[PDB]
Amino acid sequence: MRALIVYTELTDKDSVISHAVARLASELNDEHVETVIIRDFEDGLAYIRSNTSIDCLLYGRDMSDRDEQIQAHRLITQLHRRQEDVPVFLLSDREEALVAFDRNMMEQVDEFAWILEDSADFIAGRVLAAIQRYRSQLLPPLMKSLIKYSDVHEYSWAAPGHQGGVGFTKTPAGRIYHDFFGENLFRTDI
Amino acid sequence: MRALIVYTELTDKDSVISHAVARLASELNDEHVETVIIRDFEDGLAYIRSNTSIDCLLYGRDMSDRDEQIQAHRLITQLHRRQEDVPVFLLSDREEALVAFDRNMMEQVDEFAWILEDSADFIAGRVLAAIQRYRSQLLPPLMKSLIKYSDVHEYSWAAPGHQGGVGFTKTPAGRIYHDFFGENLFRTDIGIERVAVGSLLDHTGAFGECEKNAARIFGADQSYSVVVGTSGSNRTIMQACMTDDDVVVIDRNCHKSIEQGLILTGAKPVYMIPSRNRYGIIGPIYPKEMTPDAIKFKIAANPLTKGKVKQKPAYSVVTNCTYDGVCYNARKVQDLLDGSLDRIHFDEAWYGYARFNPLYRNHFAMRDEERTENEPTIFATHSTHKLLNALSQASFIHVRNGRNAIDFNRFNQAYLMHSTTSPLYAICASNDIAADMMDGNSGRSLTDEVIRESIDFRQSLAYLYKEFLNDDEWFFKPWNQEMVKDPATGKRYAFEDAPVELLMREQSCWVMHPEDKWHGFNDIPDNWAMLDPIKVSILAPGMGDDGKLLDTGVPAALVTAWLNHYGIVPTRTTDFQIMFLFSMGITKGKWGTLVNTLLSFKRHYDNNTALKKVLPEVVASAPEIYGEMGLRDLGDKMFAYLQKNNPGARLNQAYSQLPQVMMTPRDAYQQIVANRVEAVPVDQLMGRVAANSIIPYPPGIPMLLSGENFGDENSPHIHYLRSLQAWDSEFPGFEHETEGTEIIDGQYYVMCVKT
Amino acid sequence: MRALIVYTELTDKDSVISHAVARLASELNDEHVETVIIRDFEDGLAYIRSNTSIDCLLYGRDMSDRDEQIQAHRLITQLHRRQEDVPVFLLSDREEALVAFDRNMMEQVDEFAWILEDSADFIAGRVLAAIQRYRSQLLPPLMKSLIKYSDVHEYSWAAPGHQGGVGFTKTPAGRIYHDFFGENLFRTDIGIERVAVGSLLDHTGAFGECEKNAARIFGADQSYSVVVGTSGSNRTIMQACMTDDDVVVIDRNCHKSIEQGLILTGAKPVYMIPSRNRYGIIGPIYPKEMTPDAIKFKIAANPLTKGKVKQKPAYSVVTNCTYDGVCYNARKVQDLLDGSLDRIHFDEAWYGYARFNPLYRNHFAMRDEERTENEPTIFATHSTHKLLNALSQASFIHVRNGRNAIDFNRFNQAYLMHSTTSPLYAICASNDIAADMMDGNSGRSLTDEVIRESIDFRQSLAYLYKEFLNDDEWFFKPWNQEMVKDPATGKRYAFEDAPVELLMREQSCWVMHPEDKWHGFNDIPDNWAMLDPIKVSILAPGMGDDGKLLDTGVPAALVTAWLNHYGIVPTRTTDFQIMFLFSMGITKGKWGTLVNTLLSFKRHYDNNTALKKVLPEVVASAPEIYGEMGLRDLGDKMFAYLQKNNPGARLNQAYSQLPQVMMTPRDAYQQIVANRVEAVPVDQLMGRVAANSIIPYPPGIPMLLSGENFGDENSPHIHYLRSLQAWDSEFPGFEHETEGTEIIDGQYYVMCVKT
């Protein structure tokens, strides 16, 4: 589980937003969510264009700057080109975000996180819930069922005879073969 | 133990103050006091607005800058909103602080720490002493005594038999259970025979202190902690107030525990009928139901009480607020009922926070007022788990003594009759902590948080509604005023354009005015009812402002299914109405999720997405009809059904006529006990007496009670039951609820008295 | 996950088997399976007798030694006493195990592991699969579903408002509360609107599975889980069974919830009078109270029911066992009452374990028998928290349908009338786990442990009694048989000399025989009553075997004060009787502590130690009389008081005559409601009607109920109240309890009906 936090300048004194984002990142790392913190939309865009899985996007911008609004929209569109249903939270001061509320905001924002006036534990819980919801819908049906059933290891009394690859691990060449191709290939040969 | 040090610029060279604060932080960390150092009041304020426990605040400012003086005052006020008695030390140069000394300084400063000329060890010692003093007074009495006694582990030779959870750790499943719920839950299950704690039933020890503290907080003369919920609370109040030879005045909008009390006492009920609007929302009882004339008319017209017209009613019950968030003006309700009654019961099960925010002023039972001697006795039941912070089954009875009051010895018999001899002290401790969380500044702070959250949701939803309207498109709108008026400046506002401080401060922005069209309770007096902001109803399109369906619409059953798919279970629902609850357990900004979900619905409703993708659990009900079909198609089918059959007029006819009463609820229940009852199909209910209550959803309030007649072949009540059954058969998976009926072969049976 | 490997000597050179087991243990530790390796069956047995969860047993023995075969069989049987379905693998050489293959092997072996010729990875995989299979079936249904659903954290938009405990973590005291009780308690407080779990009130989901499982375990047709305790259980059974026009047969040894049910139903009661012994212990109702002749006589002699002699009683209640541990032969009780009754209620609140040990055979309600069609309906209430392992307020109703049964639709109305609409699911989960702990082998194992513990205490105390007797000195003796008789060999035994297996196996060693002098219930039939071994009464010296006080003695009030000083609070106490409770939460050998304490008393009683040293809390009551005084001095003063006033004959006269009945309990309670009542001093109770019940301790059962007359100036009941008051005034700090009286100025007031 990995969350990307892209924020540029949310307070007139960057200390406040920096410490709030630090507390949030600490809570996320406590619930086993790796975090990547980026301070510019260009670097965030370059990070998204690498083939890294991002399970949640938390961004915050100036909220009075149209240039950063366009940059953030471009960021989220780039994110959803290949990672289409990733949750996006808006990190913002409450009032700056409520004066900017409209349909265009909600077409790209999934959640609000008032970072400056809320517990980081609460936001982290909501992030983790959104990540779990996202990952439960990610795989296509057959792959999902095969990955679930590959955890079942017992000896069935029917073919294939290698029985999830157990048959191979009885000669040394068979053990080399089995280690080369890995266990899951043979566990899905059901 | 955690100390927050917020200092900005105390010396002309920041090195001096920085090194002094570093030495102080080192000494505090040596005495086991975690420290958080912040260099700006904005970041300190943001840190305080997280739910972190702060045991001491040490701050220092410029001392020549008025802007930082205001920032520091705001910081300390924010700190004390929820952490009310935290010690505050001033970190300062001696002379700059002594020239600034006055009453205003000492109203917020508790201690001085001359950081630049004193040992850090001395300051740390004084900080630690202040922290210990603060933490010794933090817990409420019962919780404090239970936490102390939970350290006692020895085998007592008496029940409960699990002996602090030791009994569970003897089988493997018991060990899993014990590890899941933890040791402390079982260590506090001690039994009523420990004099170190007291007993609930005797009202002694920490339990007496708890109930006196709760009476202080909630503004009552006496308070009673209940471990059977507001069911038990209502049941014991009714058992104490009325007897078999009494007549009582019952809000027809009553919880089933009220009829349980009627069955257990045997009293003869008279009903005040509430009002409806076009959306099927149950509204307030009008004042013309409560006047002494109306009550004497109702008594004289009742087949059971017409021989009691010379008799004063012994009890009345009013539900405030209603399930849909309608709050009565309880001052005026009390003044009307004081003309006929000595005892008034307010079932405030959903309405326990109301005392702790000025927005609800005069709209609850236990008010801060000058109390006359000629006042009636006032009972108020709170379900502490519904909207306060307590475990299930926790409840309070609050008594404000007046005319014809019930003293303690008489009331305790009814109290014991409906209680247990072995109460679970975790429930009592949750009552204690729930009353504590509302005491002082924290009650106001928490109710403000919830109300601001709900107002944000309301204004955002109204904004989106107008915005889709400019696109000539449909959307969900909140059920509240469209235009508000600032009384001070006289300026008018669209609801979504009004300032949040106006809506949180001004009570008239929530009153139902007889000239406004939003609430739909025609002919309501002014300043009689109010909308509770945190019971947020949203209206699906389809109902017209005059009471007839529009050409097109979206039924709320489909949107409710959509929401249930996503884990969002609404509390209340009608044909076009969905009620969401904002509680003090909600977090800030969560409502955005809800907005998002609604927007998703609209897209999938406009694209007519196949039900197989979006709502497979609905297709799983009747795959032959719900497969092969889309979302907008099912919506249009439901709306055409509503146009053809129009169950709203059915509801109005069933609830505007009260059924004929044949016997008291106790007599009908005793027909059940005597086995003189039988299940009857709906098509055969003519002239049959109901043996139990029938509560259809909607509207969620009882249509018939025990002992009432279903009526003729033309009775509106049988017609409405048929309407519900017809919906249920037409739309599988979207079946209504009806408490009091069995459903055999998709067909309703009512248990009626044998002829 | 933990695997126990018990192997002794499998190869002629232990190196081979040792290295094979080491490789296996290494593989298991690689798949996250902790291992415990033991080289002897005695140490393995001692390890199993600790309460450690073992998920798999892998054992290997010599395979040519019959002694180790027996040791291994004993090991596996001990394992499955409390961990019943744990997988057992045989570790063996192939051929030694295949020559030993037979049915007896496979009755205890689940898997083979040829440890000497197979990969340790393969064996570890099969062990892990068996462990996972075992753990998936370990929890009972409701607990399993709650543990699964507790992982769901999202904000629901409905009550409870604390939202899985999030609401508490917003004030500092709330955070302390939340940390003390832990997260899982609040995560399981979910409300009744989650279809993943079901609802208690509808009996659906995991709640239906739970109640069906409990009906299976406890031997009932239907079971009902109750969150209001046996108070609520009794109250709902009585509400379902009887009406205002009924006559009912009540054990005069009744819990106050029985009279609460009488008040709530209005039925006219007739009382069966229990017996006493010389120690003031309440014993069984004799069969001559239960015959149809006796019941028709009682009905015809009652001022309230003499117009109902042609009417069949609708209900009877019998308390089994009594508070002092006297168990009726419930087969014979049922056969007697089957001649007058269709419904019999057994209030088995203290007696829930009885089904699960053969020592209680035929002495409880839900028996393993061939069931006739002409049997009456049987109700049984268990207080699952008193002697089973459950949280307070947990209870079961058990129904075995017979004549004039109450079907589900009729019973559920009474069930809902006395319940809450928001049950705390922790209580329901505790019922579920308590029923699970008694299922299978573990019920027998746990009841055996408790009974053996209590028998050890009894025999040790009887031994010390005889040993002090040979020294011609006094001591405490247990209240049980002095001589037991083995029926098989006919051999007689002193109780302290009998084999423990005889006393745990043979039921006749606990029956009260009419020729024995220990129990003191003169004229009792044989094979009618039994002593429950785990309710251990000890007798202080001072009462003679004929009913009169001896020349010297030690009153139990002083010994009770001594025990309370040390944290040992007895359940029951009379003049010379102290009852201790052994529960399944007790640990082994704990009773020694109790023995030690008693011995201490004797020393400090013989040395006449000053009360200031040993019992300062007693001197704190009246320092003018209890200072300056010693322990033996106060004991002699108390005993002289008992000799002069003799309250035992007072108790016998007050409880051998029933008071005159003036009205039903409901009519007296309704006089309370009508405010027609008043407090009255004891000296003025002549001819006054009691408005509530009077329950003096001793004997702890009600002396008067509501609506009964105190009587003339010569009434035994007023005399006994005066005796209690006189004791209380003479000996401050040793005051009796009397439920139903107020104590103003150290003087008793009873709330009586106004004339």
Author numbering:
A (entry chain F): 1 to 190
B (entry chain D), C (entry chain C): 1 to 755
Give sentences copied directly from the paper behind this entry:
These enzymes decarboxylate either Lysine (LdcI, also called CadA), Arginine (Adc or AdiA) or Ornithine (OdcI or SpeF) into corresponding polyamines while consuming protons and producing CO2, thereby buffering the bacterial cytosol and the extracellular medium to promote bacterial survival under acid stress conditions. Here we show that the Adc from a multidrug-resistant human pathogen Providencia stuartii massively polymerises into filaments whose cryo-EM structure reveals pronounced differences between Adc and LdcI assembly mechanisms.
This type of dimerisation is typical for proteobacterial LAOdcs and for pyridoxal 5′-phosphate (PLP)-dependent enzymes in general, and leads to a completion of the active sites of each monomer buried into a cleft at the dimer interface. The N-terminal wing domain protrudes into the centre of the double ring and is involved in stabilisation of the decamer assembly though inter-dimer contacts (residues 1-139). The Root-Mean-Square Deviation between P. stuartii and E. coli Adc monomers is 0.52 Å (over 4424 atoms), which illustrates their strong overall similarity. At the sequence level, the wing domains of the P. stuartii and the E. coli Adc proteins are the most different (52.14% identity) whereas the PLP-binding domain is the most conserved (77.33% identity).
